[PDB]
Amino acid sequence: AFELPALPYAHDALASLGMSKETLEYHHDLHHKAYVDNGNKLIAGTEWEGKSVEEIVKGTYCAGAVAQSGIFNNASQHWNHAQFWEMMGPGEDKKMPGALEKALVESFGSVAKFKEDFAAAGAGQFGSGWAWLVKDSDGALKITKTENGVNPLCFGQTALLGCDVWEHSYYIDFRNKRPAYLTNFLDKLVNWENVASRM
Amino acid sequence: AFELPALPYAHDALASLGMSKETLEYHHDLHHKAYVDNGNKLIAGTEWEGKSVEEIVKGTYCAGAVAQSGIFNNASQHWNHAQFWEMMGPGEDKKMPGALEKALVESFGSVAKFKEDFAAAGAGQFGSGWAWLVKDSDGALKITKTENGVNPLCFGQTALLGCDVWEHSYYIDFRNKRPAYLTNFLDKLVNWENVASRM
Ligand SMILES: [Ca+2]
Ligand SMILES: [Fe+3]
Ligand SMILES: [Fe+3]
């Protein structure tokens, strides 16, 4: 069965970096929990019951549909949130590993440009979804955006970084200011070691 | 040009019925404002500049696209929010006109059953969107749900009631509790006279 992973830090460890305890309580303890629970209930007694999250996401994604299945919606969001918690971390001025810095410069011209493009994608996803830094099928880095729970697994890409732009992710702390949220996220919240580890 | 309509009540007139002043300030004065402003900017100097909101919504909708154009996203949301404010109103125990009540009983079995079905549709729109009561082109009353800004105009239906289930619409007052929000909306917020007037 799907299980809700523990956060790798205390619920208040991101507060001084602009993501409140309250946000982490609702987002992790309630929203992510619901993806786990709803996922489990929909998967029970199906062909997907044995399988890994990744297999279920890839297997249930319908490229030709506006809305995805309940199984997909929950499995995809379970995976997304599991990555998201690990992609953030406490600590001022978290180190960006050399290998990642180099790869960002190579693909975007500069880290600054990468951050602008990432933030623009997040601002540009109309409604609920995610902005991503991915490694594409040619091994190049690029920015994508997706709706709802859709994610890079759906496209044979490797996620390096994801930012939740569903309003629940930021509304408590930023209200309607999704751009300020994205900027802050990139400046203060990202665990670049975790990002680098996915390359 | 698009213009932001005034609310038909004071910003705090819904507070005792479960939609806070703060929600109306953010949702009306910032979110709806942005659809108006961004819509105007995107439409300026296009073939759509002359046209009514309704014509723009119907003309720019791309049947089957997951993501619609910027023009559509803003025009559709402008129309949606304009209906939404008029569909709510102050006053404890607002009354339902007979013609509407009869139509609902005929189509759903009871008003209670209608409300359950409406709430279920709103809960079931994964991500951002709207739940609706519509009169379709056959004259039948029925419940629909749509993503993001998509609405009944896109399907040749007449909207009787719409409820915003984008998280901004309820997160301040209900956090993650979208079902409690929907129940409260139907029990306390809906101006049934405005609903009836659309039939
Ligand atoms: Ca720094
Ligand atoms: Fe989320
Ligand atoms: Fe809204």
Report CB contact under 8 Å: A66, B64: yes
Distance A106 CA to ligand 1 centre (A): 21
* Closest listed residue to residue B87, CA positions, set B197, B183, B169: B197
Reported resolution in A?
2.0
| Structural method | X-ray
B73 chain-A contacts, CB cut-off 8 A: 126
User: Is B172 part of the contact surface with chain A (CB cutoff 8 Å)?
Assistant: yes
Nearest ligand to the CA atom of A111: 1
The Cα–Cα gap between B58 and B126 comes to: 23
* A186 close to A85: Cβ distance less than 8 angstroms: no
The Cα–Cα gap between A44 and A20 comes to: 35
Tell whether residue B31 is among the known ligand binding residues: no
Q: Give backbone dihedrals phi and psi of B50, rounded to 5 degrees, phi first.
A: -65, -20
Task: Please state the three-class secondary structure of chain A as a single string.
Answer: CCCCCCCCCCCCCCHHHCCCHHHHHHHHHHHHHHHHHHHHHHHCCCCCCCCCHHHHHHHHCCCCCCCCCHHHHHHHHHHHHHHHHHHECCCCCCCCCHHHHHHHHHHHCCHHHHHHHHHHHHHHCCCCEEEEEEECCCCCEEEEEEECCCCHHHHCCEEEEEEECCHHHCHHHHCCCHHHHHHHHHHHHECHHHHHHCC
Report CB contact under 8 Å: B126, A68: yes
User: Is A177 part of the contact surface with chain B (CB cutoff 8 Å)?
Assistant: no
Report CB contact under 8 Å: A126, B67: yes
Total structural domains in chain A? 1
- The B141-147 sheet, strands edge to edge: B141-147, B129-135, B158-164
Report CB contact under 8 Å: B26, A128: no
Which of B26, B68, B175 shows the shortest C-beta gap to A176? B26
CA A44: distance to chain centroid? 25
Number of residues that make up chain A = 199
Domain residues for the domain of A189 are: 1-199
For B159, the enclosing helix (H) or strand (E) is: strand B158-164
Nearest-neighbour CA in chain B from A96: distance (Å): 32
Q: Which two tokens stand for residue B104?
A: 């609902």
Distance A73 CA to ligand 2 centre (A): 12
